[PDB]
């Protein structure tokens, strides 16, 4: 029941409230694909996908709008996504879990935030 857990929930909370242009872009859904997979594996696989997303879409122009605020919104998105990638990776403590091979980013996050809230609820 780490402080990280809290931060991960806060970051997810912060991510869900305001939607971006990128949030509709797809990412592999690892929750329905779970076969006897351990919590660590999930956290790891969750992080893995996010890492792949923000590395791919960081420079994406669709995600960067014309407005100065659309730029700012996206900038905090990548920032937060990176934050989660590190926090989630550390919780799993696995050296890697390639997910290979979909879901809406915002839907994925919404599902993830639910797990964390149930985890934090537990402890």
């Amino acid at each position: 029941c780490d402080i990280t857990l809290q931060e991960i929930i806060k970051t997810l909370n912060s991510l869900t409230e305001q939607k971006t242009l990128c949030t509709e872009l797809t990412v592999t859904d690892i929750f329905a694909a779970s076969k006897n997979t351990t919590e660590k594996e999930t956290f790891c696989r969750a992080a893995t996908v996010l890492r792949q997303f923000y590395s791919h879409h960081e420079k994406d122009t669709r995600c960067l709008g014309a407005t100065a605020q659309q730029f700012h919104r996206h900038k905090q998105l990548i920032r937060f996504l990176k934050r989660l990638d590190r926090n989630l990776w550390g919780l799993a403590g696995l050296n890697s879990c390639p997910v290979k091979e979909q879901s809406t980013l915002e839907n994925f996050l919404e599902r993830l935030r639910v797990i964390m809230q149930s985890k934090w609820f537990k402890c």
């Binding site: 409230e17 305001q18 242009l21 669709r62 709008g65 014309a66 407005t67 605020q69």
Partner: protein, 183 residues
Amino acid sequence: LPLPEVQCFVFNVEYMNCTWQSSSEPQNLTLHYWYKNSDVQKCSHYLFSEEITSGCQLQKKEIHLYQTFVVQLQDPREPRRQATQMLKLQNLVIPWAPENLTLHKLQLELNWNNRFLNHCLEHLVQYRTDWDHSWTEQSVDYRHKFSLDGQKRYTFRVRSRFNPLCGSAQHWSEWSHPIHWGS
């Protein structure tokens, strides 16, 4: 069919950006607006994303809060393809990040300012020392005054929101440039 949705925000009641996602579409779109229950016009300032309309901008003279605001997007080739939207602009306000941060001992007091938005705004202040892992955030009234070691190095920052008094707006302004103290 169908049309994209328009995102309208009023920035510290100076100008208003009205945008939409042009990127999702098969292939210049027209925008008109009017105020319901008042005494239709064309957008005088067009924002272009890739030489096709990104959105529109309304200057202060054209902006009226507490007056029902209505917008109509339309397609030049297929005029019968169009959409209308009604907005509460007092809920759409997003103030600039607080400026002119100041600190003086007395018992430390922090101060920031805005242009004529001071009575509408609601603030949240964050602070930490070199000895702190986490940001300590403290909500503030529209009064905008905060109170509280030279061995510890202090860092303050704050943002504001248009709420509740002048409006119900959800979104927070960006974080003000951090102010420092100590060591």
